[PDB]
Design a binder for this molecule. Structure first.
Ligand SMILES: O=C(NCCc1c[nH]c2ccccc12)c1ccc(CN2CCC[C@H](C(=O)NCCCNc3c4c(nc5ccccc35)CCCC4)C2)cc1
Ligand SMILES: *[C@@H]1O[C@H](CO[C@@H]2O[C@@H](C)[C@@H](O)[C@@H](O)[C@@H]2O)[C@@H](O[C@@H]2O[C@H](CO)[C@@H](O)[C@H](O)[C@H]2NC(C)=O)[C@H](O)[C@H]1NC(C)=O
Ligand SMILES: *[C@@H]1O[C@H](CO[C@@H]2O[C@@H](C)[C@@H](O)[C@@H](O)[C@@H]2O)[C@@H](O[C@@H]2O[C@H](CO)[C@@H](O)[C@H](O)[C@H]2NC(C)=O)[C@H](O)[C@H]1NC(C)=O
Ligand SMILES: *[C@@H]1O[C@H](CO[C@@H]2O[C@@H](C)[C@@H](O)[C@@H](O)[C@@H]2O)[C@@H](O)[C@H](O)[C@H]1NC(C)=O
Ligand SMILES: CC(=O)N[C@H]1[C@H]([C@H](O)[C@H](O)CO)O[C@@](O)(C(=O)O)C[C@@H]1O
Ligand SMILES: *[C@@H]1O[C@H](CO)[C@@H](O)[C@H](O)[C@H]1NC(C)=O
Ligand SMILES: *[C@@H]1O[C@H](CO)[C@@H](O)[C@H](O)[C@H]1NC(C)=O
Ligand SMILES: *[C@@H]1O[C@H](CO)[C@@H](O)[C@H](O)[C@H]1NC(C)=O
Ligand SMILES: [Cl-]
Ligand SMILES: [Cl-]
Ligand SMILES: [Cl-]
Ligand SMILES: [Cl-]
Ligand SMILES: [Cl-]
Ligand SMILES: [Cl-]
Ligand SMILES: [Cl-]
Length: 527
């Protein structure tokens, strides 16, 4: 029996067998008052003490969210859907600790992605038991509110101030500061890591003064706040809040009366209408996302980044080779996971209208001009590959590179990776390459399990990535010092060195996507 005394009461965990040893898991510890009734849309409220033993032996409810129904029965998409009951009562977190209990272990806190509209910490690819067993770190993950229930915004109005899901994340960081020492963790050695909207979340904790004292270092996988999908303008948020009110019959003049009307709606009615507040949105529209609320976020974050207003610490940032391809089969014409998706010029132009709905004709022509200067005008995959690169460079790679440059210009060590390994088990077709989200299982050490049908080269790759991530968290330096490994240089704004991650040979390269990102970062914001 493993019972830990936390500040709010005792929790009981369970023993897990991992690789011939033991990991202790505490799954589903509450860290806030359930945000129900009058607490819906508010900031998370502090948890009141209990006196029995809370049984932390199963993953808790996932927060309410809409579900991907595009590929029923298909593992490639269903692996991202929630795998526990949906409930507004979802503010829980998980703790994996090594056995025997560590003395002063470094702590890794995972923040999942999902566009701020979906996600849950209980997904199989976020299972922290391998990291705790192999590297003897403590792993923490939390559920935070998503969609309108997490990010509905009436700026300055505490009934729905915005950024509630980010404050959920923050209160869980605070829980770790106050309680992790009882589990054998070091609250002075805490590394946030996350992917996609989780990585954008990590980048916003770097900018939020209220999070400054709650962590040490940060890892950003395939995301950052300056990505075009990651922050909702106050103009959009207000129009989207009022649109949700109209769709649900909750339009009033007293804005507080709107929120009170929205508080009497079943979660399902909110979710169903959430999806329609943005009329001409992109696929996978970030309907309700982070805003400049004057609380969590004190100014437009691009200004904060440019003028050096962020936590001074080390960062690890990276992207995958084919970030853009997954999104093509959620709306681009002519695309399908079940054929090779050779598209025409006309289909490409149609795809740009899908992914750039608010943009002028000239802006879309400029994308076409920069991505259709072919080396060989006859390759039939030209337009298919160009559209994936357009979407991946615009939405992920160029914002990640720009974040890393601007962050490093203020003197801190930054490390950039380019993940280019395609999982041997990938259920998606080959044309989609190295997809958004498919480095996560390597970071969490799933290929270390020899039973799981990964190759030997993938076991070794995951083993090296796990060690580099653990060494970054413990020591601020993502090296693998023992196996004659390529040394990972610091990313500087001048030479812009990065490390490629693959099964063949890791290489030091410079100036990833230099020509493309000059287009997206310097020219396209003007259109
Ligand atoms: O994550 C989002 N947005 C990123 C930024 C971005 C936004 N719009 C873009 C347009 C272009 C480029 C970027 C963007 C996102 C996620 C869900 C929603 C809301 N849902 C609700 C259910 C119905 C519909 C849907 O079908 N959702 C599919 C679930 C996603 N599941 C996958 C995840 C990963 N990898 C996958 C790989 C293959 C297939 C599915 C993958 C990794 C991170 C975790 C989720 C919309 C909105 C935005
Ligand atoms: C656990 O270790 C900390 C020190 O952690 C190290 O330094 C952190 C800043 C982190 O970034 C990592 O590099 C390391 O894990 C101990 O903190 C010390 O606490 C004493 C209290 O008397 C204080 O006087 C020292 O200044 C602290 N040292 C540092 C470096 O901040 C802490 O005491 C350790 N706790 C246990 C139970 O072992
Ligand atoms: C690849 O498939 C897409 C999608 O078509 C669907 O999926 C296929 C696997 C097959 O089951 C079809 O019957 C399905 O309709 C094809 O795109 C469609 O092309 C038709 C032209 O006949 C057009 O009217 C549809 O609107 C297209 N659908 C979409 C979503 O764009 C595409 O032509 C196929 N490409 C190749 C190279 O085979
Ligand atoms: C919490 O759990 C208590 C103990 O659970 C039992 O004992 C341990 C050793 C495990 O083997 C577990 O599988 C067993 O079921 C219960 O006695 C207690 O009732 C539980 N409390 C609640 C509220 O569920
Ligand atoms: C409310 C909810 O979503 N899930 C609850 C489930 C289900 O009500 C039942 O399993 C029936 O489906 O019951 C519990 O007692 C359990 O066994 O974990 C508590 C848990 O919170
Ligand atoms: C929000 O903006 C769209 C497009 O500009 C418009 O059609 C809609 O009526 C607006 N909603 C409100 C509540 O004004
Ligand atoms: C709206 O209602 C709340 C509570 O019912 C009240 O405090 C407030 O004064 C009303 N008017 C405005 C403009 O907020
Ligand atoms: C280093 O190589 C040895 C085999 O020579 C292997 O057992 C070990 O897991 C490797 N370590 C890392 C961190 O890759
Ligand atoms: Cl209530
Ligand atoms: Cl309700
Ligand atoms: Cl052509
Ligand atoms: Cl390797
Ligand atoms: Cl160079
Ligand atoms: Cl350059
Ligand atoms: Cl240019």
């Amino acid at each position: 029996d493993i019972i830990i005394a936390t500040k709010n009461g005792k929790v009981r965990g369970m023993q897990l067998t991992v690789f011939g040893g033991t990991v202790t898991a505490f799954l589903g510890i509450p860290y806030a008052q359930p945000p129900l009734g009058r607490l819906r849309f508010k900031k998370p409220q502090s948890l009141t003490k209990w006196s029995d033993i809370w049984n932390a032996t199963k993953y808790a409810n996932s927060c309410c969210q809409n579900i991907d129904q595009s590929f029923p029965g298909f593992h490639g998409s269903e692996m991202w859907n929630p795998n526990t009951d949906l409930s507004e009562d979802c503010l829980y977190l998980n703790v994996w600790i090594p056995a025997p209990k560590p003395k002063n272990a470094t702590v890794l806190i995972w923040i999942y992605g999902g566009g701020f509209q979906t996600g849950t910490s209980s997904l199989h690819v976020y299972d922290g038991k391998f990291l705790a067993r192999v590297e003897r770190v403590i792993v923490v993950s939390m559920n935070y509110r998503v969609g309108a229930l997490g990010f509905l915004a009436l700026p300055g109005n505490p009934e729905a101030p915005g950024n509630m899901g980010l404050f959920d994340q923050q209160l869980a960081l605070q829980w770790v500061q106050k309680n992790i020492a009882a589990f054998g963790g070091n609250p002075k050695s805490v590394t946030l890591f996350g992917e996609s909207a989780g990585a954008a979340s990590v980048s916003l904790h770097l900018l939020s003064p209220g999070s400054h004292s709650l962590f040490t270092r940060a890892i950003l996988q395939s995301g950052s706040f300056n990505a075009p999908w990651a922050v909702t303008s106050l103009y959009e948020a207000r129009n989207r809040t009022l649109n949700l009110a109209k769709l649900t019959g909750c339009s009033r003049e007293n804005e507080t009366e709107i929120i009170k009307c929205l508080r009497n709606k079943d979660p399902q009615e909110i979710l169903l209408n959430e999806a329609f507040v943005v009329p001409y949105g992109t696929p996978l529209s970030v309907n309700f996302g982070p805003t400049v609320d004057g609380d969590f976020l004190t100014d437009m974050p691009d200004i904060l980044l440019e003028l050096g207003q962020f936590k001074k610490t080390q960062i690890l940032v990276g992207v995958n080779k084919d970030e853009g391809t997954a999104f093509l089969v959620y709306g681009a014409p002519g695309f399908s996971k079940d054929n090779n998706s050779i598209i025409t010029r006309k289909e490409f132009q149609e795809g740009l209208k899908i992914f750039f709905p608010g943009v002028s004709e000239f802006g879309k022509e400029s994308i076409l001009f920069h991505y259709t200067d072919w080396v060989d005008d006859q390759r039939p995959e030209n337009y298919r590959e160009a559209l994936g690169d357009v979407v991946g460079d615009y939405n992920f790679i160029c914002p990640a590179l720009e974040f890393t440059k601007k962050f490093s210009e203020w003197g801190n060590n930054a490390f950039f990776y380019y993940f280019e390994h395609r999982s041997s088990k990938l259920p998606w077709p080959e044309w989609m390459g190295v997809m958004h989200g498919y480095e996560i299982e390597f970071v969490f050490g799933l290929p270390l399990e020899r039973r799981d049908q990964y190759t030997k080269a993938e076991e070794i790759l995951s083993r090296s990535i796990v060690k580099r991530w653990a060494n970054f968290a413990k020591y601020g330096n993502p090296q693998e010092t023992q196996n004659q490994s390529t040394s990972w240089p610091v990313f500087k704004s001048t030479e812009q060195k990065y490390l490629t991650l693959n099964t063949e040979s890791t290489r030091i390269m410079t100036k990833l996507r230099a020509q493309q990102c000059r287009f997206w970062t310097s020219f396209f914001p003007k259109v």
